[PDB]
Paper text:
For both the TbLAP-A and LmLAP-A complexes, the electron density was sufficient to model the ligand, albeit with less than 100% occupancy. The TbLAP-A--actinonin complex had six molecules in the asymmetric unit, and local noncrystallography symmetry was imposed for the protein chains. The electron density for the ligand was generally poor but sufficient to build the actinonin in all six chains. Their densities varied slightly, so that the ligand was modeled in each chain individually, with variation in their conformations. Nevertheless, the actinonin coordination was identical in all chains and differed only slightly from that in LmLAP-A. Actinonin in LmLAP-A and TbLAP-A is coordinated by the Mn2+ ions and hydrogen bonds. In both structures, the two Mn2+ atoms coordinate the O-2 and O-4 oxygen atoms of the ligand. In LmLAP-A, the side chains of K299, D304, K311, and D389 form hydrogen bonds with O-2 and O-4, and the main-chain oxygen of L420 and the main-chain nitrogen of G422 form hydrogen bonds with N-1 and O-13, respectively. The corresponding residues in TbLAP-A are K289, D294, K301, D371, L402, and G404, and A405 forms an additional hydrogen bond with O-27 in four of the six chains. Superposition of the active sites including the actinonin molecules reveals the high similarity of the conformations actinonin adopts, with the only difference being in the hydroxymethyl-pyrrolidine moiety, which forms a hydrogen bond in TbLAP-A but not in LmLAP-A, where it is bent away from the corresponding residue (A424).
Numbering used by the authors:
A (entry chain D), B (entry chain B): 3 to 521
C (entry chain F): 3 to 189, 194 to 521
Amino acid sequence: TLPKAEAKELSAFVQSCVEYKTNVCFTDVAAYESNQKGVLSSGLAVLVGTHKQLRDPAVQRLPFYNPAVAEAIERVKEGGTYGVLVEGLANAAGSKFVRVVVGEVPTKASRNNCPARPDVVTXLVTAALDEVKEPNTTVDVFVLSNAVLPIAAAVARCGKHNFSAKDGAAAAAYNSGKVSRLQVVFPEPPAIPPKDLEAVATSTQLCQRLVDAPPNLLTTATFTEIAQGYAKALGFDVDVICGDDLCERGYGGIYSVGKAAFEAPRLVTLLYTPKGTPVKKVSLVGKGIVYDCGGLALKPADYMKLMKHDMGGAAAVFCGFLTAVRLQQPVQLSCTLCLAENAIGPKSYRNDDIIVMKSGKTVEVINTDAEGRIVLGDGVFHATNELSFTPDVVIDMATLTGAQGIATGRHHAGLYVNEEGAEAAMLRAGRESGETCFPVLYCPEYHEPEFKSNHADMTNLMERRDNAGVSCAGYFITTHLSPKFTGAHIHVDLAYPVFNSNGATGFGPALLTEYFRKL
Amino acid sequence: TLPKAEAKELSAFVQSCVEYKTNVCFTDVAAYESNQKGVLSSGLAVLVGTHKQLRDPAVQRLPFYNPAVAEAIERVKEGGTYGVLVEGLANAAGSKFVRVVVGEVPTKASRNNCPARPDVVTXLVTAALDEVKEPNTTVDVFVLSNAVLPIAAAVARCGKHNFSAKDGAAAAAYNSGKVSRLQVVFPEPPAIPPKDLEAVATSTQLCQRLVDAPPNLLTTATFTEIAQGYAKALGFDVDVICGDDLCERGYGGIYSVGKAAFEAPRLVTLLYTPKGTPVKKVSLVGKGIVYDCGGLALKPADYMKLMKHDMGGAAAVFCGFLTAVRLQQPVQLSCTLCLAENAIGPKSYRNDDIIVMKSGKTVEVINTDAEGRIVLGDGVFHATNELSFTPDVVIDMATLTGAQGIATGRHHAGLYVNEEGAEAAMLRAGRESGETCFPVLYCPEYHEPEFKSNHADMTNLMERRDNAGVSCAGYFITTHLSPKFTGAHIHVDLAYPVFNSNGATGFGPALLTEYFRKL
Amino acid sequence: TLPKAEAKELSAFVQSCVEYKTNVCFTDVAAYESNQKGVLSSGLAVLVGTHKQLRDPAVQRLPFYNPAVAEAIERVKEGGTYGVLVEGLANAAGSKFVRVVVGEVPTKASRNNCPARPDVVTXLVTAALDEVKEPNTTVDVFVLSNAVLPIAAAVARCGKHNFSAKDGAAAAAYNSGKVSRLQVVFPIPPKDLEAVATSTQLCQRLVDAPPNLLTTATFTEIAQGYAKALGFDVDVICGDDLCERGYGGIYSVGKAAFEAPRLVTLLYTPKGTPVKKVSLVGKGIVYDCGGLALKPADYMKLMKHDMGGAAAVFCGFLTAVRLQQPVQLSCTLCLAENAIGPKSYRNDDIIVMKSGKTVEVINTDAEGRIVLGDGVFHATNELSFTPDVVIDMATLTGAQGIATGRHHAGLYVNEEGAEAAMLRAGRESGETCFPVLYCPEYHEPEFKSNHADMTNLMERRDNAGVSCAGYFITTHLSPKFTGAHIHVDLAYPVFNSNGATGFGPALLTEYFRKL
Ligand SMILES: CCCCC[C@H](CC(=O)NO)C(=O)N[C@H](C(=O)N1CCC[C@H]1CO)C(C)C
Ligand SMILES: CCCCC[C@H](CC(=O)NO)C(=O)N[C@H](C(=O)N1CCC[C@H]1CO)C(C)C
Ligand SMILES: CCCCC[C@H](CC(=O)NO)C(=O)N[C@H](C(=O)N1CCC[C@H]1CO)C(C)C
Ligand SMILES: [Mn+2]
Ligand SMILES: [Mn+2]
Ligand SMILES: [Mn+2]
Ligand SMILES: [Mn+2]
Ligand SMILES: [Mn+2]
Ligand SMILES: [Mn+2]
């Protein structure tokens, strides 16, 4: 039994995540010119675009423009912002001055990046919002790109985060009182509906909120309750295998990892079937390690800092699934959340233990901190073998390896994929969404020998360290796919793209939405 | 309460160890020539001996010999094998070809080694069995050494291990389906009976099985049940002091170490008295740390890999005892198993705790990972003071220190002994059995000062590292001997000889059998 | 400087590398059946192929086949070998028995690998040669693949290495007396395959050799020896000349060492109209001790391999000349020892690169990119022509092994077309490759420096390390250059547990072959 006060706090936090709606609205120049009549929404306005786009004639005719803003556009450095004051410009707050902030987006974009450069867009708007005069206002963000999806996510992930514990916000279920309503204004009427872009943005910021939150708030239990809350709200099926049931029912992997912890591990599977004929049957699986302490292979304090992020794969596939339901994307989805805390205690699984996986294959544990692949190997077997349908495509997302960062870096998720066509599709989706990706070596013939075990079918870690580590971890997961399954397997290592110096990025959901969108 | 499924698995595993019988039979050339009539047992046959022995005239007259095998004997490198095919040679499996594998054993053997070189014999047979055409067959291993005991153990420890979790053998109580019946064929009828050699081989492979097994199968509890199972089977007395009873009854050492763990520590004492007059009264004590995680002095993951082996001393004295009973060796034995898990948790004994040992002397714990000597100090006090007799000789066996490997290495167990005569005897037994040993410095005057404590009688670790570490650990154990005891004390550090790159070696039992045999 | 005895030894070693010719010959079943008349070349014979290929009818009709070999083919495990004795089979050595060794090659091959699986082929033949009855014989290796180039290199890199110091071979200029003549028998010209094989084994020999034999000086003398032999131009900028002439990078790195650093540029122009103008640049760190950022002893073990990029581009160039490939080639070897001493470049020093840009040294052990940045500027700016393609090869980063592994070299490439071409060449040659992220917009910020143009190392460690090192090199390209840049990180593929692999030369030969 938890203390009564802590249960009150946790309940409040669950509700805050279930009832979270975004702070971002979307419109266009013409529709703004009619709805607002040229009156600005508050004492701040932001303008963002490429060097050439800021010098387009249409910019002059915007309602905040004046000879100062024109100079600001001259003076601004690429990648940076320039602010100016304008006196007596008509505005809803009645402020004698209005602050205009220009920001220049670069046009340079390599073949493996999103040509819109939403990464910079996010930074520019974050900078501009740092000079905010009053909180709980509405800030007009005029963008000059028409790439609506990437920008929508880029602005959603920007500025101050919706999760906060500062200045007594712990008393208000950790909802930031410092967030500004943001009204994005595209040149054209969008391409995608405003009500749709708002969903994508909500999913990005919910993913962000979950990831950000500390493990004393977001436990295996509260994450499950949140999924349940959304299941009741949007009307989809939820299946939960909790604690010792996992051992009874053959799920040795997720059980062994999570059994040490105070809050029991759970395999939470969600289900959505669209009205009409689905274009593809897709199964999602997320690594949901709510805190990776390392187990008995205890991490040193420096590497254990920010391990609340180890749930980031689960939060991605979850919020990606929530968008699909809300928009009624015509994809038949399973979403399986592998929830556990890799904890240290009397009941820790051990460096030498042998696990009997739900696949039936045995795993010699060399290192308890390689927990992610074990928990996923049960997740992917569940999806390919225990569900009411066989998927065409399996997508597993996880904050799996440090090797990821060394190979593909902080902005690109690593792809271990068994088919060129599906790799290409997910890659394309990265470029379109702005939540980019890149391939790591697919070569099972060289990965398998690294897992030779004396007494088990396989180990959970490479014999040798410097031999395609992002890939070998991916291979391990594939060995626990059902032999029923013949289709396409996409493993997504997103260890670093989930976070930056300001906290979580909400990376994952938008990438999925865009991948689904083009099947 | 464990999960129902895990209890079923554990029970199955207990039974598999209790009812384990060997896969090795033994006979001689003449007896084989008459029983088999020159028909080979399967599509594989192995021939092993020294350079001179392979060129003895008697080899030609063997039933698999031909002009190819004669060339194989020329071509073979010392320490290696050479395989050849022979067409239409009569055999029980009806295979068109029979594979003959020659292996050359070296004759070089230093004063501290076994002149037969069973180490190489084990390797040669392991190599030959790697080309096995069908599992569950019978392979004829023709050896040309008459040193029957060392060869018997050497073949028992060789090839694929009886413990296995591969290819669904987890469903069959972890019994390997991949093992070959091995029929050893000596030149002469063996100096020891075949029914006796089979026991020695069974003990070696049981020891092997226990050590190999992961700590999730072999717990303090299941090990105790195994001892009990054998006690009911062979009719000897078993005494168990479990969990908190240890604290109540003054056993502070073994209690403190093991109390953190999920499964409680146990001091299991076994007793055997032969029908007539015993030649000697011997007390065995084994370090039975089922997993050494280090305690609060938590081991780094690399050094914690393979710590399921830390029980290896207990498994040695246990299986050594089982052989004595089964062969009815005329030795009066006590066998005390010091079973605990050095675990990490809320209830861990601490680096600064003071233990009150069963000896009555107080121990300041400097480092919780030096758990072995504490546990043994209670074990040896129990044997020298609480039993129905006072032993003439105390033998304690343990996987005690890393220092062992630095000093005596992977093949020789370290001996800390208080009397030259007993050191000599155990050394002799090493050379005869092939489970070899070597002395480490005995010099208590220089060991004692390393354990000076401010507030306790002693510490559990040296002030200075690099002052006869194998020995100092031995000394600690001697301080907890009863003052009643005045006989011979043999401390056996077998940290490395218990294992190799293939897993456990079953080192210990045969050394004991041979030591007992020559009192 | 040196003792008279050591100079004698070094000279002998130089000559051994210059006059090295391969031990491998190539032929086919029909041509062997006619030349040899069915008499085997020695008391050993080897048979290598896939599960289905070993069961093809044509195998039966081979001159060593018998009912035992047929069982050996049954008994063999995939990836392993099985040996058998055959009595009185006709053979050149007159041995009462002949040993036949079968080896089974797998057919499983992922999209990023060579379908022939020459990796396994190499292992199989190495295993079979371990049971050799007499050295200095000729062993008949019957292969059942027709993928001639990858197999030729695979057999060249296999078995006992030509460099050896065992059993007094130090007295015979470190030439192994334990090597077998290998006659490969298939079911490209033989004189051409022999060159590719010679290049693979020369690359191997250079890499294997210890840094007390292969110094910056002896490597340069070897290049000179080959320049005199095959008639091509050689340009050498030695020691302090590098400082005088603006080459701050390669000078600073190598100036601490006993033997001075050298920028050795080689030149070849084919008789007709070249299909492309290509400039090669190799990291030639003869020993990477780390400099003042001294490596720990474990990571400094096997750092004689840090020259492996140079040995690749050098031997790749030698093949091009010998076969007269119609490519106009520059080959620039960046030779230095990253040494520790009174004159070590320092962690805080600022280098003035030949490019003109300034480099703040954060860590002296990131020596490779500095040395290469001068190499690629030399090629793109100081030569008699402007290349269409720049290929730089180096044993550059440990990150490589984490990202692409032991069998695939990492590719940082600025154009999809050239990446594709080099990738294809990998799959064909068997010296495989794989891409690492190309994204300069994210790499550049990692090199921000307070007082210099750039640093030589990332601010942050976990951010596409194989790629960032590549980017550094691109900043020192000439602005004259607008063509295709291929950076090849081959840190791990150059070696395995048996020593050097001779990885690089065959990959180039095959890339050139199709341009
Ligand atoms: C020993 C295996 C531990 C598991 C892999 C972990 C990640 C993890 O625990 N996921 O649950 C990791 O990032 N490991 C890194 C790591 O082991 N590698 C792989 C090779 C070098 C280095 C990369 O940083 C470092 C940061 C600890
Ligand atoms: C403080 C630990 C005291 C117990 C010695 C332990 C062995 C142990 O845990 N036994 O249960 C050990 O690991 N010994 C080694 C060790 O601590 N030493 C002492 C100096 C070098 C080395 C000797 O092997 C390690 C490094 C493998
Ligand atoms: C810090 C500067 C390191 C310089 C580059 C070296 C390799 C080198 O010196 N080549 O000359 C490297 O990557 N070394 C590795 C290394 O430092 N890294 C970088 C990140 C983690 C780890 C392995 O990639 C290991 C092998 C020691
Ligand atoms: Mn993790
Ligand atoms: Mn982990
Ligand atoms: Mn221990
Ligand atoms: Mn210990
Ligand atoms: Mn280097
Ligand atoms: Mn270096």
